[PDB]
Design a protein around this ligand. Structure first.
Ligand SMILES: CC(=O)N[C@@H]1[C@@H](O)[C@H](O)[C@@H](CO)O[C@@H]1O
Ligand SMILES: [Cl-]
Ligand SMILES: [Cl-]
Ligand SMILES: [Cl-]
Ligand SMILES: [Cl-]
Ligand SMILES: [Cl-]
Ligand code: NA
Length: 129
C-alpha cells in the first residue's frame, strides 16, 4: 500500500506515535517519506546481508525474522513479512520498541540526515488529524 501524507499521519496518530518519546507526528511522517516513500511494501538489502522492511524500513539484524540474516535477533517478535502489510500496526509497535532502545529516532539514518532539525510540522500541515 502507498499512503497519502495526511492518510499516514492520521494512521500514525491513531496508533499513538504523535509525541511518542517527545517525537511529534511530523518526525514519523518525514521518516516514512525518506525511508519508504510511504510504501508499506518497501524492502532494501544492506551490505551486512540484513534487510530493511516496510514504511519505516525496520532491519532484520535486530528487530524481525526473515530466516536469512545469520546471527540476528527478533526483538519485536514478528516475521519481517508482517512489516510489509497495509495495516501499519506491526511497523508502529516495533518502531515504539526501537525509538525506546536508547538512541531515539537516530535509529533511522534518513531521520538523522533529512528530518532532524528541520521544520517537520510541514509534513502534517493541512491534514484533518
Ligand atoms: C530503526 C531501524 O531499523 N532503521 C533502519 C536501520 O536499522 C538500517 O540500518 C537502515 C538501513 O541503512 O534502515 C533503517 O534506517
Ligand atoms: Cl508527500
Ligand atoms: Cl509535527
Ligand atoms: Cl535469521
Ligand atoms: Cl493501518
Ligand atoms: Cl530521545
Ligand atoms: Na532477525
Amino acid at each position: 500500500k502507498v499512503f497519502g501524507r495526511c492518510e499516514l499521519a492520521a494512521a500514525m496518530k491513531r496508533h499513538g506515535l504523535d509525541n511518542y518519546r517527545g517525537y511529534s507526528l511530523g518526525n514519523w511522517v518525514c521518516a516514512a517519506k525518506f525511508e519508504s516513500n510511504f510504501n508499506t511494501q518497501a524492502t532494501n538489502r544492506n551490505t551486512d546481508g540484513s534487510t530493511d522492511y516496510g514504511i519505516l524500513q525496520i532491519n532484520s539484524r535486530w528487530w524481525c525474522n526473515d530466516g536469512r540474516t545469520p546471527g540476528s535477533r527478533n526483538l519485536c517478535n514478528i516475521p519481517c513479512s508482517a512489516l510489509l502489510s497495509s495495516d501499519i500496526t506491526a511497523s508502529v509497535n516495533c518502531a515504539k520498541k526501537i525509538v525506546s532502545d536508547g538512541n531515539g529516532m537516530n535509529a533511522w539514518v534518513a531521520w538523522r540526515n533529512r528530518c532532524k532539525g528541520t521544520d517537520v510540522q510541514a509534513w502534517i500541515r493541512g491534514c484533518r488529524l
